[PDB]
Amino acid sequence: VTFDKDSRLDYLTGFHKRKLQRQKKAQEFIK
RNA sequence: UGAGGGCCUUGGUCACGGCCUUGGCUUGCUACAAUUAACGAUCAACUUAGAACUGGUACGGACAAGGGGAAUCUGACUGUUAACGAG
């Protein structure tokens, strides 16, 4: 394994886009 | 070429005007053209329907009800750290 800055920035800076993406997927599935 | 009207006139007749007779614009019948009258004339009819000045549109620029975010425990419970609950 390796330690890469891009992956850690992607994980840390997010936590909000992922949640809204999951909400959109659930909403469209319900529709 | 026959008829009817108009201007002429000639004799006889009755006191300029009647009566009886004599010879020279409309319409009728026939003969050759026209049938693109597919034209012209005349009488009679005919007047101007338009009003109103409503909004939603896509665009350009600020408001919009109001402190936000993440993860766990937990409650009914699908096809991705799923979702949901003003827990």
Tab-separated table of N, CA and C (backbone and C1' of nucleotides) in Angstrom, chain B residues 26-74:
chain	number	residue	atom	x	y	z
B	26	U	P	-89.122	57.817	-89.476
B	26	U	O5'	-90.459	57.047	-89.085
B	26	U	C5'	-91.021	57.170	-87.786
B	26	U	C4'	-92.372	56.504	-87.711
B	26	U	C3'	-92.429	55.069	-88.212
B	26	U	O3'	-91.989	54.123	-87.253
B	26	U	C1'	-94.199	56.296	-89.170
B	27	U	P	-91.160	52.830	-87.725
B	27	U	O5'	-92.240	51.933	-88.477
B	27	U	C5'	-93.400	51.472	-87.802
B	27	U	C4'	-94.456	50.990	-88.765
B	27	U	C3'	-94.094	49.777	-89.605
B	27	U	O3'	-94.234	48.554	-88.903
B	27	U	C1'	-95.068	51.425	-90.988
B	28	G	P	-93.372	47.272	-89.342
B	28	G	O5'	-94.172	46.680	-90.585
B	28	G	C5'	-95.502	46.204	-90.438
B	28	G	C4'	-96.083	45.781	-91.763
B	28	G	C3'	-95.210	44.867	-92.609
B	28	G	O3'	-95.284	43.508	-92.212
B	28	G	C1'	-96.036	46.621	-93.954
B	29	C	P	-93.995	42.556	-92.340
B	29	C	O5'	-94.007	42.096	-93.863
B	29	C	C5'	-95.125	41.412	-94.411
B	29	C	C4'	-95.043	41.343	-95.914
B	29	C	C3'	-93.763	40.746	-96.478
B	29	C	O3'	-93.782	39.329	-96.500
B	29	C	C1'	-94.239	42.773	-97.592
B	30	U	P	-92.417	38.503	-96.678
B	30	U	O5'	-92.101	38.610	-98.236
B	30	U	C5'	-90.873	38.134	-98.761
B	30	U	C4'	-90.501	38.842	-100.039
B	30	U	C3'	-89.014	38.898	-100.348
B	30	U	O3'	-88.527	37.713	-100.956
B	30	U	C1'	-89.947	41.051	-100.607
B	31	A	P	-87.077	37.139	-100.565
B	31	A	O5'	-86.058	38.113	-101.307
B	31	A	C5'	-85.835	38.008	-102.706
B	31	A	C4'	-84.754	38.953	-103.169
B	31	A	C3'	-83.428	38.866	-102.426
B	31	A	O3'	-82.599	37.822	-102.908
B	31	A	C1'	-84.090	41.128	-102.592
B	32	C	P	-81.250	37.420	-102.129
B	32	C	O5'	-80.180	38.497	-102.616
B	32	C	C5'	-78.811	38.151	-102.773
B	32	C	C4'	-77.901	39.297	-102.405
B	32	C	C3'	-77.113	39.127	-101.113
B	32	C	O3'	-75.928	38.369	-101.289
B	32	C	C1'	-78.145	41.253	-101.129
B	33	A	P	-75.132	37.798	-100.014
B	33	A	O5'	-74.202	39.010	-99.561
B	33	A	C5'	-73.534	38.987	-98.307
B	33	A	C4'	-73.439	40.371	-97.712
B	33	A	C3'	-73.149	40.440	-96.219
B	33	A	O3'	-71.764	40.330	-95.934
B	33	A	C1'	-74.927	41.915	-96.772
B	34	A	P	-71.253	39.781	-94.512
B	34	A	O5'	-72.143	40.560	-93.445
B	34	A	C5'	-71.643	41.701	-92.762
B	34	A	C4'	-72.191	41.765	-91.361
B	34	A	C3'	-72.095	40.464	-90.576
B	34	A	O3'	-70.838	40.324	-89.936
B	34	A	C1'	-74.305	41.306	-90.446
B	35	U	P	-70.460	38.974	-89.158
B	35	U	O5'	-71.106	39.172	-87.716
B	35	U	C5'	-71.216	38.084	-86.814
B	35	U	C4'	-72.618	37.957	-86.276
B	35	U	C3'	-73.031	36.567	-85.809
B	35	U	O3'	-72.607	36.276	-84.486
B	35	U	C1'	-74.718	37.474	-87.202
B	36	U	P	-71.087	35.851	-84.181
B	36	U	O5'	-70.380	37.224	-83.790
B	36	U	C5'	-70.966	38.091	-82.823
B	36	U	C4'	-69.924	38.789	-81.982
B	36	U	C3'	-69.054	39.803	-82.720
B	36	U	O3'	-68.717	40.868	-81.832
B	36	U	C1'	-67.686	38.103	-81.813
B	37	A	P	-69.634	42.186	-81.769
B	37	A	O5'	-70.816	41.791	-80.775
B	37	A	C5'	-71.822	42.739	-80.430
B	37	A	C4'	-72.953	42.113	-79.652
B	37	A	C3'	-73.565	40.868	-80.286
B	37	A	O3'	-74.087	40.028	-79.257
B	37	A	C1'	-75.200	42.560	-80.164
B	38	A	P	-73.249	38.762	-78.728
B	38	A	O5'	-71.924	39.400	-78.119
B	38	A	C5'	-71.919	39.980	-76.817
B	38	A	C4'	-70.528	40.032	-76.231
B	38	A	C3'	-69.545	40.939	-76.966
B	38	A	O3'	-68.603	41.469	-76.032
B	38	A	C1'	-68.763	38.711	-77.036
B	39	C	P	-68.959	42.768	-75.153
B	39	C	O5'	-69.553	43.805	-76.205
B	39	C	C5'	-68.695	44.598	-77.010
B	39	C	C4'	-69.465	45.632	-77.793
B	39	C	C3'	-70.108	46.749	-76.985
B	39	C	O3'	-69.201	47.776	-76.629
B	39	C	C1'	-71.677	45.895	-78.527
B	40	G	P	-69.424	48.621	-75.278
B	40	G	O5'	-70.745	49.466	-75.561
B	40	G	C5'	-70.735	50.533	-76.497
B	40	G	C4'	-72.127	51.006	-76.838
B	40	G	C3'	-72.939	51.614	-75.707
B	40	G	O3'	-72.577	52.956	-75.429
B	40	G	C1'	-74.295	50.139	-76.969
B	41	A	P	-72.865	53.593	-73.983
B	41	A	O5'	-74.435	53.861	-73.982
B	41	A	C5'	-75.018	54.772	-74.902
B	41	A	C4'	-76.525	54.694	-74.881
B	41	A	C3'	-77.188	54.950	-73.538
B	41	A	O3'	-77.315	56.332	-73.254
B	41	A	C1'	-78.145	53.034	-74.549
B	42	U	P	-77.249	56.863	-71.739
B	42	U	O5'	-78.661	56.454	-71.127
B	42	U	C5'	-79.867	56.944	-71.691
B	42	U	C4'	-81.065	56.176	-71.194
B	42	U	C3'	-81.228	56.094	-69.686
B	42	U	O3'	-81.808	57.261	-69.131
B	42	U	C1'	-81.554	53.953	-70.634
B	43	C	P	-81.528	57.654	-67.599
B	43	C	O5'	-82.539	56.739	-66.774
B	43	C	C5'	-83.942	56.869	-66.943
B	43	C	C4'	-84.683	55.728	-66.293
B	43	C	C3'	-84.390	55.495	-64.820
B	43	C	O3'	-85.098	56.369	-63.959
B	43	C	C1'	-84.288	53.439	-65.966
B	44	A	P	-84.426	56.870	-62.587
B	44	A	O5'	-84.270	55.542	-61.721
B	44	A	C5'	-85.414	54.865	-61.222
B	44	A	C4'	-85.082	53.465	-60.769
B	44	A	C3'	-84.214	53.348	-59.528
B	44	A	O3'	-84.950	53.520	-58.331
B	44	A	C1'	-83.420	51.868	-61.192
B	45	A	P	-84.208	53.979	-56.982
B	45	A	O5'	-83.497	52.651	-56.468
B	45	A	C5'	-82.611	52.683	-55.360
B	45	A	C4'	-81.804	51.416	-55.266
B	45	A	C3'	-80.491	51.527	-54.507
B	45	A	O3'	-80.659	51.434	-53.104
B	45	A	C1'	-80.121	50.420	-56.560
B	46	C	P	-80.091	52.590	-52.146
B	46	C	O5'	-78.520	52.338	-52.138
B	46	C	C5'	-77.970	51.178	-51.530
B	46	C	C4'	-76.475	51.130	-51.708
B	46	C	C3'	-75.733	52.405	-51.340
B	46	C	O3'	-75.460	52.490	-49.953
B	46	C	C1'	-75.000	51.633	-53.462
B	47	U	P	-76.259	53.529	-49.023
B	47	U	O5'	-75.635	53.301	-47.574
B	47	U	C5'	-74.463	53.998	-47.163
B	47	U	C4'	-73.211	53.200	-47.431
B	47	U	C3'	-71.915	53.846	-46.953
B	47	U	O3'	-70.981	52.821	-46.615
B	47	U	C1'	-71.835	53.579	-49.294
B	48	U	P	-71.100	52.051	-45.215
B	48	U	O5'	-69.691	51.318	-45.089
B	48	U	C5'	-68.522	51.833	-45.753
B	48	U	C4'	-67.361	51.889	-44.790
B	48	U	C3'	-67.315	53.119	-43.889
B	48	U	O3'	-66.844	52.779	-42.590
B	48	U	C1'	-65.341	53.011	-45.184
B	49	A	P	-67.829	52.083	-41.535
B	49	A	O5'	-67.253	50.602	-41.433
B	49	A	C5'	-67.701	49.706	-40.399
B	49	A	C4'	-66.557	48.841	-39.929
B	49	A	C3'	-65.799	48.098	-41.029
B	49	A	O3'	-64.412	48.053	-40.723
B	49	A	C1'	-66.706	46.541	-39.498
B	50	G	P	-63.433	49.187	-41.274
B	50	G	O5'	-62.460	49.451	-40.042
B	50	G	C5'	-62.827	50.333	-38.991
B	50	G	C4'	-63.749	49.665	-38.002
B	50	G	C3'	-63.420	49.880	-36.534
B	50	G	O3'	-63.904	51.121	-36.047
B	50	G	C1'	-63.872	47.586	-36.928
B	51	A	P	-63.229	51.806	-34.760
B	51	A	O5'	-63.874	51.030	-33.530
B	51	A	C5'	-63.277	51.087	-32.245
B	51	A	C4'	-63.688	49.915	-31.393
B	51	A	C3'	-62.847	49.672	-30.152
B	51	A	O3'	-63.205	50.514	-29.069
B	51	A	C1'	-63.162	47.632	-31.304
B	52	A	P	-62.102	51.455	-28.375
B	52	A	O5'	-61.374	50.492	-27.338
B	52	A	C5'	-62.115	49.768	-26.366
B	52	A	C4'	-61.313	48.615	-25.818
B	52	A	C3'	-59.903	48.959	-25.359
B	52	A	O3'	-59.873	49.437	-24.026
B	52	A	C1'	-59.841	47.058	-26.767
B	53	C	P	-58.804	50.545	-23.580
B	53	C	O5'	-57.410	49.772	-23.612
B	53	C	C5'	-57.173	48.648	-22.771
B	53	C	C4'	-55.801	48.065	-22.999
B	53	C	C3'	-54.635	48.924	-22.510
B	53	C	O3'	-53.587	48.083	-22.032
B	53	C	C1'	-54.440	48.572	-24.842
B	54	U	P	-53.592	47.584	-20.505
B	54	U	O5'	-54.607	46.360	-20.517
B	54	U	C5'	-55.109	45.807	-19.313
B	54	U	C4'	-55.164	44.306	-19.398
B	54	U	C3'	-53.916	43.579	-18.925
B	54	U	O3'	-53.872	43.414	-17.521
B	54	U	C1'	-54.549	42.743	-21.037
B	55	G	P	-52.494	43.628	-16.729
B	55	G	O5'	-52.282	42.244	-15.965
B	55	G	C5'	-51.092	41.487	-16.130
B	55	G	C4'	-51.238	40.461	-17.225
B	55	G	C3'	-50.051	39.534	-17.427
B	55	G	O3'	-50.080	38.433	-16.535
B	55	G	C1'	-50.815	40.355	-19.524
B	56	G	P	-49.333	38.502	-15.116
B	56	G	O5'	-49.108	36.972	-14.738
B	56	G	C5'	-47.900	36.310	-15.083
B	56	G	C4'	-48.009	35.593	-16.405
B	56	G	C3'	-46.720	34.979	-16.925
B	56	G	O3'	-46.446	33.718	-16.342
B	56	G	C1'	-47.792	36.174	-18.667
B	57	U	P	-44.932	33.202	-16.226
B	57	U	O5'	-44.517	32.928	-17.736
B	57	U	C5'	-43.156	32.956	-18.125
B	57	U	C4'	-43.009	33.026	-19.622
B	57	U	C3'	-41.579	33.069	-20.132
B	57	U	O3'	-40.997	31.781	-20.226
B	57	U	C1'	-42.855	34.755	-21.200
B	58	A	P	-40.428	31.043	-18.915
B	58	A	O5'	-39.236	30.144	-19.467
B	58	A	C5'	-37.899	30.610	-19.426
B	58	A	C4'	-37.472	31.197	-20.745
B	58	A	C3'	-36.122	31.895	-20.734
B	58	A	O3'	-35.031	30.996	-20.851
B	58	A	C1'	-37.711	33.311	-21.745
B	59	C	P	-34.102	30.670	-19.579
B	59	C	O5'	-33.033	31.852	-19.564
B	59	C	C5'	-33.375	33.140	-19.079
B	59	C	C4'	-32.915	34.214	-20.026
B	59	C	C3'	-31.729	35.040	-19.559
B	59	C	O3'	-30.484	34.393	-19.751
B	59	C	C1'	-33.413	36.484	-20.341
B	60	G	P	-29.341	34.508	-18.626
B	60	G	O5'	-28.875	36.024	-18.716
B	60	G	C5'	-28.513	36.748	-17.551
B	60	G	C4'	-28.464	38.227	-17.832
B	60	G	C3'	-27.987	39.116	-16.695
B	60	G	O3'	-26.579	39.136	-16.548
B	60	G	C1'	-29.942	40.033	-17.624
B	61	G	P	-25.918	38.898	-15.103
B	61	G	O5'	-26.662	39.937	-14.151
B	61	G	C5'	-26.588	39.804	-12.740
B	61	G	C4'	-27.197	40.987	-12.032
B	61	G	C3'	-27.515	40.785	-10.557
B	61	G	O3'	-26.389	40.962	-9.714
B	61	G	C1'	-29.383	41.736	-11.637
B	62	A	P	-26.263	40.115	-8.354
B	62	A	O5'	-27.402	40.713	-7.414
B	62	A	C5'	-27.823	40.015	-6.251
B	62	A	C4'	-28.607	40.904	-5.321
B	62	A	C3'	-29.432	40.185	-4.264
B	62	A	O3'	-28.685	39.808	-3.121
B	62	A	C1'	-30.801	41.738	-5.370
B	63	C	P	-29.001	38.426	-2.362
B	63	C	O5'	-30.321	38.730	-1.520
B	63	C	C5'	-31.609	38.459	-2.052
B	63	C	C4'	-32.692	39.119	-1.239
B	63	C	C3'	-33.517	38.195	-0.363
B	63	C	O3'	-32.877	37.886	0.863
B	63	C	C1'	-34.952	39.660	-1.546
B	64	A	P	-32.236	36.430	1.099
B	64	A	O5'	-33.233	35.437	0.355
B	64	A	C5'	-34.294	34.807	1.058
B	64	A	C4'	-35.577	35.591	0.942
B	64	A	C3'	-36.793	35.007	1.644
B	64	A	O3'	-36.821	35.310	3.030
B	64	A	C1'	-37.384	35.714	-0.547
B	65	A	P	-36.073	34.372	4.105
B	65	A	O5'	-37.245	33.875	5.060
B	65	A	C5'	-37.936	34.783	5.913
B	65	A	C4'	-38.940	34.074	6.791
B	65	A	C3'	-38.419	32.822	7.496
B	65	A	O3'	-39.063	32.686	8.761
B	65	A	C1'	-40.227	32.240	6.092
B	66	G	P	-38.347	33.223	10.097
B	66	G	O5'	-37.014	32.357	10.202
B	66	G	C5'	-37.068	30.962	10.470
B	66	G	C4'	-35.814	30.258	10.013
B	66	G	C3'	-34.517	30.700	10.675
B	66	G	O3'	-34.318	30.099	11.942
B	66	G	C1'	-34.210	30.602	8.336
B	67	G	P	-33.234	30.635	13.056
B	67	G	O5'	-32.190	29.430	13.106
B	67	G	C5'	-30.839	29.600	13.577
B	67	G	C4'	-29.854	29.500	12.433
B	67	G	C3'	-29.585	28.105	11.879
B	67	G	O3'	-30.483	27.681	10.858
B	67	G	C1'	-27.531	29.130	12.372
B	68	G	P	-30.596	26.120	10.492
B	68	G	O5'	-29.373	25.882	9.497
B	68	G	C5'	-28.681	24.615	9.457
B	68	G	C4'	-27.333	24.770	8.791
B	68	G	C3'	-26.535	23.487	8.593
B	68	G	O3'	-26.833	22.801	7.382
B	68	G	C1'	-25.190	25.042	9.721
B	69	G	P	-27.024	21.211	7.401
B	69	G	O5'	-25.554	20.663	7.676
B	69	G	C5'	-24.500	20.926	6.763
B	69	G	C4'	-23.196	20.312	7.211
B	69	G	C3'	-23.225	18.830	7.545
B	69	G	O3'	-23.200	18.000	6.398
B	69	G	C1'	-22.021	19.993	9.211
B	70	A	P	-23.860	16.536	6.447
B	70	A	O5'	-22.826	15.672	7.298
B	70	A	C5'	-21.495	15.479	6.844
B	70	A	C4'	-20.641	14.797	7.883
B	70	A	C3'	-21.152	13.463	8.404
B	70	A	O3'	-20.870	12.382	7.533
B	70	A	C1'	-20.464	14.806	10.220
B	71	A	P	-21.818	11.084	7.520
B	71	A	O5'	-21.463	10.330	8.878
B	71	A	C5'	-20.159	9.819	9.108
B	71	A	C4'	-19.937	9.482	10.562
B	71	A	C3'	-20.837	8.407	11.148
B	71	A	O3'	-20.398	7.099	10.827
B	71	A	C1'	-20.712	10.243	12.639
B	72	U	P	-21.287	5.819	11.221
B	72	U	O5'	-20.888	5.524	12.736
B	72	U	C5'	-21.573	4.537	13.489
B	72	U	C4'	-21.670	4.914	14.945
B	72	U	C3'	-22.874	4.355	15.690
B	72	U	O3'	-22.678	3.025	16.137
B	72	U	C1'	-22.671	6.667	16.143
B	73	C	P	-23.838	1.929	15.949
B	73	C	O5'	-24.855	2.231	17.138
B	73	C	C5'	-24.503	1.963	18.488
B	73	C	C4'	-25.520	2.531	19.445
B	73	C	C3'	-26.957	2.080	19.233
B	73	C	O3'	-27.236	0.814	19.807
B	73	C	C1'	-26.902	4.426	19.489
B	74	U	P	-28.250	-0.198	19.079
B	74	U	O5'	-29.639	0.581	19.062
B	74	U	C5'	-30.358	0.824	20.263
B	74	U	C4'	-31.451	1.844	20.056
B	74	U	C3'	-32.581	1.429	19.128
B	74	U	O3'	-33.552	0.622	19.769
B	74	U	C1'	-31.847	3.599	18.551
